Amino acid sequence: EKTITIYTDGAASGNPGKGGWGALLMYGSSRKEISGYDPATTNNRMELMAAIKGLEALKEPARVQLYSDSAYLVNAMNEGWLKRWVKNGWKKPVENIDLWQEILKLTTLHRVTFHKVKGSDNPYNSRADELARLAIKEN
Ligand SMILES: [Mg+2]
Numbered sequence: 001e002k003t004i005t006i007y008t009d010g011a012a013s014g015n016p017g018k019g020g021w022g023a024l025l026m027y028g029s030s031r032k033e034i035s036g037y038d039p040a041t042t043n044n045r046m047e048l049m050a051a052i053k054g055l056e057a058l059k060e061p062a063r064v065q066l067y068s069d070s071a072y073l074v075n076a077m078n079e080g081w082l083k084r085w086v087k088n089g090w091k092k093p094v095e096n097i098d099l100w101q102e103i104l105k106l107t108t109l110h111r112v113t114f115h116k117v118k119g120s121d122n123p124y125n126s127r128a129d130e131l132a133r134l135a136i137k138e139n
Contacts, residue, residue: 003063004026004058004062004065005064006054007026008021008054008070009068009128011129012136016040017040017041018037018038018139019040019045019132020046021046021050022035022050022127022129022130022131022132022135023035023050023128023131024128025054025057026124035134037135037138037139039139045099047068050132055103055107056106064112065113066113067124067125068125069118069125071116074116076100077114
């Protein structure tokens with residue numbers, strides 16, 4: 001029954017290169033931070049992974065407001081593309097089908113609204129970005 005706000009970010013050095021992701025989960029004054037590293041990845045993959053991991057961190061089904069700088073993510077969800085991809089057999093082939101399948105599952109468990117942020121945008125996405133970069137630096 002909770003509405004949880006999640007701020008997600010991913011970063012990678014190159015295409016492909018070392019990458020990281022971060023998410024900040026917020027419920028009133030409560031906060032939870034998560035992050036991780038991937039040794040060979042793309043910006044798009046880390047953007048999706050941040051959202052996946054953020055949603056996976058929820059302990060119970062929730063209503064979620066998810067803030068991301070990722071147009072890749074947010075457009076797929078808000079322009080109906082993901083739903084059309086599934087309907088058309090993931091095609092030519094959509095990239096990152098493994099991650100989109102996870103996002104399909106998680107957006108059944110949780111009722112998620114996605115919001116695009118512009119970059120910098122607020123301190124919570126900034127923290128998520130810092131956490132993603134932190135993961136790369138630690139590795
Ligand atoms: Mg992002």
